[PDB]
Amino acid sequence: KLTFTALQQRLDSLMLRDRLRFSRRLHGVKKVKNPDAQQAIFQEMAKEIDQAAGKVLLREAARPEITYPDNLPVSQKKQDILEAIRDHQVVIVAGETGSGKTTQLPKICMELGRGIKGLIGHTQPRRLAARTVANRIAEELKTEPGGCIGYKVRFSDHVSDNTMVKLMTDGILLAEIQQDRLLMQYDTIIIDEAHERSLNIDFLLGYLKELLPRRPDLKIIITSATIDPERFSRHFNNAPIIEVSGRTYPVEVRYRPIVTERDQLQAIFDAVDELSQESHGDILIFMSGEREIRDTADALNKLNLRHTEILPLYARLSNSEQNRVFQSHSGRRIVLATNVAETSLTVPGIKYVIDPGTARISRYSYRTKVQRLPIEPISQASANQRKGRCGRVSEGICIRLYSEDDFLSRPEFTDPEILRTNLASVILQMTALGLGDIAAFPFVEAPDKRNIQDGVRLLEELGAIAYKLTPLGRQLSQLPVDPRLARMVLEAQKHGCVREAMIITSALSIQDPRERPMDKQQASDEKHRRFHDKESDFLAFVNLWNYLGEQQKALSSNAFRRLCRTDYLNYLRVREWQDIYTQLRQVVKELGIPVNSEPAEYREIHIALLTGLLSHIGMKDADKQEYTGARNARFSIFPGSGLFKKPPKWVMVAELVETSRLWGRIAARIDPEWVEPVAQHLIKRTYSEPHWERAVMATEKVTVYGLPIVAARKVNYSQIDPALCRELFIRHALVE
């Protein structure tokens, strides 16, 4: 015979994912009335459970022989770590450079008996990094891709049933929460490179803590660089931290700071020449954007240096191209990369690095209430990670294109991305992943609660949204820019002005490329006046863009930088502009949105913009002076705006900034009739003074955040109040 309880024990020896389905089936047998049928269904279930328990034994028998490296970088602490993991649910393993933590910790778990009933999940910030770690561990254990080591880098990829160790990015593990909130597929979860503290890492660290009581079988550990490993231990109730001494051989630091003919890449050039005098070792150059990488790879190729291969490492590269970065390379290789190179996976034989000390960093402007991508000086922690890529027995040199006092003036750490992102994006994204309510989320670092209600409001103004995510909210969270700007891009689909909108919203995401220095004020101002538009500051963005692309075709790359210096345009930000515009154009086309070919008209582009700035409308006084904005707030146009001298009745501004007073930056003239269709979710209709006219007519007043887009329009009042119009109609129709 078979009993209900008898088969529950068989479940405790199953893979976790298979337990729930059998559990639901066993309970359903309680309905069956015929006892012969119950035992009949029990026997078949027991034969199905036997196969499932056979899968565990098969996986447990196919465990390979675990080997640890001869170099003993962490292998001495490997004996120490196996003691740490087995005893505590949460262990934090701090490391430095290529200590071998990333590749041995799944092995350490596998040897501890883990990975059998659940998967050993291991996250990485980048698709490439995750794929190489898997290939790294698979060869060390002599395992082919179908074997016990796999990786998943695209949400539509899958791994074999023989997989014992799964490697993915953070975004994938988040995507998997949606369809597996208990995360039953894993019995171990390794979070790598947690020192970066992006949104996906913080979302994952918060959610795992929320999950840990519901999953006492789950053991999780957090690998990181030595950047404040203590805070993670405070996040969980208690958490033992282990510090691994990464053996780094000495690196020499040379500070080479720089202060109309000079080239921007000239500092870069002289630094590689300096390194050339020392040796022909491989050089790694960290840079800001992909176009800057292109512009440098082109300039280093025109130099025709001796026996040197210039390898620009973009994200768009094929996997066949990234494998080339690890090839034998007979001659010298100069690798040009961005922060992607700051990840644990390194180019094998790098001897020197060149660090401009600057990086494009997502940060919310409290002053102008927008999320921007400013280029700014990296932190000491980031800079020491860049220099840490010289790690090798051979002596290496790091050249820092800035003064030593500069490096010591910079802040010690980079702000975690949660503390420099506007909450609307934070809300919009955890809503899209199902992370729930923000306040109840156990953030490792909490945001500011005052901005929580201000984020909800903006998502509500933007039609993006506890709460639910409208379909355009889903589209909104797939866009790299600020939600206000993201909304304009989507609306441009309807008006056929997507090119213009992608130009403008990428332009408004960066610090203005149009420089104005004190010595050259009249000349820079004269130059910028070429693109100004009569009725829209925004059109100056489209004018300059069409021009910079016109000369980019006509001129060589060298003569282009020369033009920037001549036309007073910060070259670095002109390149960031194109970089963002392109990254924007990729997500846009991943969605069904077309991109135009003909210039859109003034009304078509500005209605699209308007959907993002509905709270930024204003109407002018009759005193020929100030404006009235949302919520009875008043402001004035920023001097230097194209509209400043002929301000219109209805204005639309990109920025409300309060210094001496509240000013409006980047203005454009609108027609208040445009506001009505894109405002249905916010308008407040008001009626007054109904009268019988030869039905009953009333006067309608429409307001958005208190402003009168429709002052008074005669309408038929029969729908708004049936009773009154019925009464009045009877008297007049009879008297008629």
From Swiss-Prot:
Motif DEAH box per record, residues: 192-195
Residues of the full protein shown: 6 to 756 of 1300
Keyword hit for tRNA processing: no
GO biological process, one term: RNA modification
Species lineage: Bacteria, Pseudomonadati, Pseudomonadota, Gammaproteobacteria, Enterobacterales
tRNA-binding listed as a keyword: no
Annotated family: Belongs to the DEAD box helicase family. DEAH subfamily.
Name assigned to this protein: ATP-dependent RNA helicase HrpA
Protein's organism: Escherichia coli (strain K12)
Catalytic activity: ATP + H2O = ADP + phosphate + H(+)
Functional note: Not yet known.
Helicase ATP-binding domain ranges (all copies): 82-245
Domain Helicase C-terminal: 264-434
EC number: 3.6.4.13
Binding-site positions, ATP: G95, E96, T97, G98, S99, G100, K101, T102
Keyword annotations: ATP-binding, Helicase, Hydrolase, Nucleotide-binding
